[PDB]
Design a protein around this ligand. Structure first.
Ligand SMILES: [Mg+2]
Ligand SMILES: [Mg+2]
Ligand SMILES: [Mg+2]
Ligand SMILES: [Mg+2]
Ligand SMILES: [Mg+2]
Ligand SMILES: [Mg+2]
Ligand SMILES: [Mg+2]
Ligand SMILES: [Mg+2]
Ligand SMILES: [Mg+2]
Ligand SMILES: [Mg+2]
Lengths: 322, 332, 322, 321
DNA sequence: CGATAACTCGTATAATGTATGCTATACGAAGTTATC
DNA sequence: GGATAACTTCGTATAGCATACATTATACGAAGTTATC
DNA sequence: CGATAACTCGTATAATGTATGCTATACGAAGTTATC
DNA sequence: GGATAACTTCGTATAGCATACATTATACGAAGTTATC
C-alpha cells in the first residue's frame, strides 16, 4: 500500500526512538524470514498466517529456543503493527502454533537458562586474589566486579558511567547516577550507592587510571599490554569487554571453560545480578528492598534467579531438623 | 470432541478456524481441554432443555444461562469459568465473545456483587502443618504395612518439599541422589514453565530421608532407576513398581484424605469442601510454619516455588504476626 | 436510536450491577436535572452541552459545594456514556465551566471538609468512662467504637458483619472477615484483626446480646428502651444508627452541639477512620502499613486526614527546638 | 470554522485555568507562530509534520526535554480546547518525542532541584544577622526562619498577613494559611513557628510596624534607607522573596559562576529540600515528613533525601554487615 | 618488522510487569483388577 | 463365581499459577584493529 | 390509650488511584520609584 | 541633577503539584415506626 510504506519510513525516520538492539534484531529476523520465504517461495510481506506458521515450525525444527522463536514472531509483529497492518499473531494459526511450540519444547525438556551466579562468596575470593596486584588492569577489573555486585547494574549500564556521574554521601560513600537502564529512560534517573569497601576499590582505579582528569571521561576504559589506561569521553569500554572481565576472572580461578558449547559455563554480564539477588534472599532482605536493588518492581525473576542452598539446603530442612 | 457444530449454524471461516484449533490442539493443556469440553456439554445440555441455539451463542441466552448457574448455587469463580470457556470457544472460532456484549458484562458484574453480598467466599486447603506431621508420624512410623510405610514417606516428602501432587507422582527413582550430609536430594525435571521457580532440586531432611529410604527398601522400586518413587500397594500388602505408570493424583489426594480419617474419623455429613487434608494441605501448612518461624517472604515463596505473594499472604493471614499496625498501637 | 434505548434497558434491567447508592444518586440528580429543564424549556435527554453548562452554573449559584456539582455532572455523564452517547463533559462548554466553578469556589473560600477525628485519646476516655456500665446499650456501643477505631472499617461494612464472619488467631485476637467494601467486591475479602483489648469489648457484647444464637445474626443490632438486645439475621442496624452512636457518644462528653448547622460538629461515621489515620501517622507507621490499615493504595487521603499537632506541635518545631 | 466558536467558549470560561497557565500558553504560542512565519507553515491548525520539525528545533536550540514537553503540551491544549485533534495523537509527533527524550537523556541531560537550605545554613545565616538592627536584615532573617520552619512555598509566604497570626499556649506563633489554591489542600491550614523563629518574626513585626493594620501582609517592601513600607493592597513579590534567598547566599559565598547554571545559590524551594533532608536525618517517617511540608508525592521527597546515607540500600548494608 | 595483549558482528536467547486466561487441584462416583 | 482393597477414570466444581505483549538486553565465537613487545 | 426510647428518606457532600496536564518556581533583565 | 537601593513587571526555561474519571459511600435533619413505660 501507500499509507503502509509511509508509516514504515516514519518509523525508520525516527528510528532513534527505539533501541539500537531493537533494530539490530528487526533486521536480523527480517533476513532470516526473507531468506526462508524466498527458498520456499512465499511473499515475505505482508506475511501470511500459514507462512509465518510453517516458518515458526521450521525454526522449531532447527532446534532453536522458545525465547528465540518468540523473538522472530515478535519482530514480525512489530513490523506489521507498526506499519498499520494486522499482526500475524492476530491470526489463530500463528498464535496457536506459537503456544504449541512452547509447550512441546518445554515438555521435551527445554528450559531457559540464566547467568551463572557470582555471589558474595565469590567476590571476597576474587578480591583476596587481586586486592594487591599493582597491575593497572587488575585494579580496574576488581572495581568493575565490586560495582557490578554492589549495584546489580547491567553491563551496558556500567559501560556508560562517566566520572561526572559520581558523587558522595556525608559518610564518604560513592553515589553513581544512572540515567538510562533497560526499563527506564528519564532525566531524573536513579542513584546507586556503593559501600565503603567498593567505593574504595573504585577510588584506587580512578587515580591509577587517571580517568578523573576530565569529568566527561567514562569511568572504565581499556588498559593496553603495557599496563596503561586509555581514558576517553567519546568511546566507552564495550560490553563484550565487560563480559570478558567476568570470563577472565572466572578462568583465573577455575581455568579453561569445559569446551561443551553450552552457555553460562563461566561468569558473564548478569552473573552479578543473579548472585546479588540470591545473596539478599538468603540474608532475609524484604521484597521491596530486593526490588530497589535491581530496579525491579515485580517479585518474579528474583524468584527465577533462585534455587538456593543445594546440598543440605535450608528453610524446611532447617525447620524440620532442630 | 465438541457438541456438534451445526451444519447450518457453523459456517465459513468458523469451520476453518475451528479446524485450525484442533490442528494445534497441543497449544493447550489437556486439563484445559477437559474443562472446555465440560462447559460446552453443560451449556449444550442447558440449551436443549431450554430450546436455545448453542452456537454461536446469543448474548441474551448466555445471560439466562449465567443466571441459571447462579441459581444452581455455583460459585462466582465457577460461573466465570463457564463464561471463559464460552469466550474461548467463540474467539478461537473467529466470532465475537459473550461478555463482549453489554448484557453479559452487566449480569456477570451483578451476579458477582449479589453473590459476594450473600456471603460467598473462596476456600483453601485445610492445613497439614508441622504439628500434624509429627502426630501422624508418631502413629504410622510403627507400622510395617507397606501402605503405611509408603503413605508416611509421601507425607514427609509432601511437607518437606512443598511440591504439587502432579509433581510427586512424576518423581522416578533416578531423580534421587545423596548429599554430603547423607540426606536425599530430589530433582524435578519437566515442569510446564520455562521459568520453573519451584526449584530444580529439593532436599529432604534427615528424618524424612529415613522415611523415604524405608519405602524404597520395602517396595523394591530401586529395581530399576526408571521406576517412579511411588506406586501401588494391593490388598495383600505388595507394592507394584512401574516405569510406565505413575500413581494417579487422585490416589495421592486419597492418602491425605485417608491419613486425616485415621486420626479424626469419618468426614462430616455436609458436602463441604476441605473437611480433611487434600493435595495442597502441606504447602499451606508449610507456608504457615515458615512464617511462624520468622522466615522471610522471598525465602518462603522460594521454598514452595510461589510467584504470587498474594497467595502466600492468603495462607498466613490469620497468623498473629500479620495482625497489623493498629493492634500493635493499641496493645503497644 | 434503537441502540440507545437498548443500552438503557440493559442497564436498568441489571441495575443491581451497581451500588444501590449509585442508583439512588442517579435518580436524584436526574429529577433535579429534569425539574430545571422543564422550568426552562430544555430537552433533558439527550442533554445539550450548552444546557448542562447553564445547569452547572445554576447549581453554583444555588451555593452548592464543588463536589456536589461534580456529582450532578458526574451522573449526567454516566447516564449518557452508558447510553452509548457522548458525555456532556465531552464538550468544551461543560468541560471548562466545571473547572471554572471549582476554581472560583475554591478561591471564594470553599473547602472540602472531613469528619471530626475520634483518636486514641477519645477512645481511651470514652472507654474508661463507659467501661463499667452493665447496660446493653453501653456495652454494644463501646464494642462498636472499638471496632471502628481498631479496624477503620466504614460504618456500612461494620453494619454487615455477621457472627459467622468472626474467628480467632492462634494468639486469641479476634479476626473479622470482610467481603465487600467501598472499593472491593470479591469472594476473597480481607481479614481485620482486633487487639486483645478490643476483642474483649466485643466478647462482652456478644455474650450479653445473644447474637451468637445464630451464626447468621449480624454482630450489632437494636437495643430497646427495656435494655434488651434484639439480634437478627435479616435486618442489620442502620448505618444511621451507627452514626448516631458517634453523635451520642460525643454529646455524653460535650453536650449539645453548636447552632451553626455546620457538618462535623460532632463525631460521625468516618470519625474513627481519620482519627486512627492520624494516630498511626504520629506513631511513625510506614506508608504501606497505614494503607494496609485503612484499605488504601495511594497516600492522598492519608495525607488529607493529616494536620496533627498545632500547640507545641512537633515535626519541625521539635526538630528546631533542639 | 466552528473552532472560532470553540475558541470563543474557551475565552468565555478562561477562569478555568490559572494565570500562569495562560501565560505559558500565550508564550509557547508566540514561539510557535514565530518559528512558523519564518519557515512558511500555517501556525494553526498545526500539521503533525510541522510540529515535529518544530520540536526538533527546540532540541537543537538546546532546551530540556521538560521544556520541550511544555511546548508540545500547550500546543495540545490549544487544539483540544478548539475542537481540533491534538498533535500528540499523531504518530510522527509521538515518535519524535520518544526520540528526543532518549537522545537527550542519553546526552546526559539531568533534571535539577533547588539547592538545600538546611539547618546548619539557617544557623550560620542567623548568627551573622542575629545581632543587627538593619530594618531589612530583621525582615530577611525572619523570612528565612519562617520558610525553613514552615516548609511553606513563597507564593504562600507572600500572602500571609498579621490578621492570620495567633498565639499558642506555649506562646509560639501559629500562622493560619487560608485560600490556598486547592480544594483538597492536603498540606495544612495551620503552621506553628518555634520559640526561636517566633522571636525573630516578632522583632520584625515591631521594627516594620506592619502590625498597624491587620490586612497588612506580614512581609513588605523596604526602601534604600531602612524604612519598611507596609501595605495590604500589595504584597512583597515572589521574585523579591527569591532574591532574599540569593542575597543571603551571596552574603556568605560571594557571587555565582559564569556558567549560566541553575540552582547555584539558594532559591524558593531551597528551604523545603533542606527541611525535608533534616527531618530525614532525624528519623521522621515519610508520612510525617510529607505532611510537615504538604507533600503528597512520595517520589519528590525521596528525591530530596536520595543522597543521604540512610538511603543507601540493602546491598550496602549487606556488604558492610 | 612480525607477533601480541587487549580490545565489531551476527545469530541466539534472556529479560521486564501482570491482569486474567489458561491450568491445577477437589472429590464423589463409576470402572478395574488382582486378592480374599 | 462373589465380595472387596485399592486403585484408575471420569466429569464437574473451584483454586491457583504463569504468560502474550512489545520491545530491550545479554551471550559468545569469530573477525578485525591497534598500540606495544 | 399517650408518651417515649431507640430506631426511612432525600438532598448534600466526601472518598477511591494516579498518569500527566495544568501550576508554580527560576532567573536575567528591563522598567520604577523614592533616597542618596 | 545624576547615581542608586530595592523593588516590580516580564518572558521563558523548568520543576512539581493535584485533578478528571466513574462510581460508591457518608451527613444529617425530618418524618415514620414500633415495642415499652
Ligand atoms: Mg480435568
Ligand atoms: Mg493444627
Ligand atoms: Mg490410600
Ligand atoms: Mg493409611
Ligand atoms: Mg482437623
Ligand atoms: Mg467528572
Ligand atoms: Mg456501551
Ligand atoms: Mg512488558
Ligand atoms: Mg471401594
Ligand atoms: Mg478511581
Amino acid at each position: 500500500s501507500d499509507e503502509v510504506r509511509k508509516n514504515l519510513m516514519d518509523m525508520f525516520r525516527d528510528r532513534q526512538a527505539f533501541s539500537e538492539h531493537t533494530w539490530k534484531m528487526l533486521l536480523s529476523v527480517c533476513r532470516s524470514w526473507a531468506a526462508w520465504c524466498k527458498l520456499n517461495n512465499r511473499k515475505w510481506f505482508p506475511a501470511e498466517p500459514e507462512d509465518v506458521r510453517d516458518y515458526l515450525l521450521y525454526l522449531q525444527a532447527r532446534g532453536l529456543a522458545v525465547k528465540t522463536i518468540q523473538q522472530h514472531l515478535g519482530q514480525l509483529n512489530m513490523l506489521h503493527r507498526r506499519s498499520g497492518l494486522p499482526r500475524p499473531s492476530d491470526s489463530n494459526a500463528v498464535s496457536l502454533v506459537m503456544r504449541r511450540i512452547r509447550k512441546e519444547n518445554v515438555d521435551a525438556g527445554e528450559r531457559a537458562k540464566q547467568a551463572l551466579a557470582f555471589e558474595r562468596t565469590d567476590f571476597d575470593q576474587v578480591r583476596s586474589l587481586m586486592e594487591n596486584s599493582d597491575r593497572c588492569q587488575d585494579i580496574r577489573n576488581l572495581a568493575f566486579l565490586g560495582i557490578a555486585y554492589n549495584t546489580l547494574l547491567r553491563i551496558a549500564e556500567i559501560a556508560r558511567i562517566r566520572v561526572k556521574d559520581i558523587s558522595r554521601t556525608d559518610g564518604g560513600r560513592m553515589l553513581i547516577h544512572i540515567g538510562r537502564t533497560k526499563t527506564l529512560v528519564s532525566t531524573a534517573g536513579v542513584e546507586k550507592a556503593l559501600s565503603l569497601g567498593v567505593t574504595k576499590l573504585v577510588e584506587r582505579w580512578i587515580s591509577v587510571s587517571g580517568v578523573a582528569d576530565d569529568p566527561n571521561n567514562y569511568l572504565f576504559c581499556r588498559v593496553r599490554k603495557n599496563g596503561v589506561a586509555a581514558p576517553s569521553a567519546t568511546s566507552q569500554l564495550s560490553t563484550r569487554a565487560l563480559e570478558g572481565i567476568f570470563e577472565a576472572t572466572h578462568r583465573l580461578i577455575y581455568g579453561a571453560k569445559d569446551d561443551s558449547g553450552q552457555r553460562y559455563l563461566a561468569w558473564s554480564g548478569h552473573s552479578a545480578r543473579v548472585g546479588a539477588a540470591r545473596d539478599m534472599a538468603r540474608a532475609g532482605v524484604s521484597i521491596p528492598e530486593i526490588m530497589q536493588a535491581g530496579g525491579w518492581t515485580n517479585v518474579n525473576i528474583v524468584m527465577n534467579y533462585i534455587r538456593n542452598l543445594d546440598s543440605e539446603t535450608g528453610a524446611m530442612v532447617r525447620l524440620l531438623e532442630d
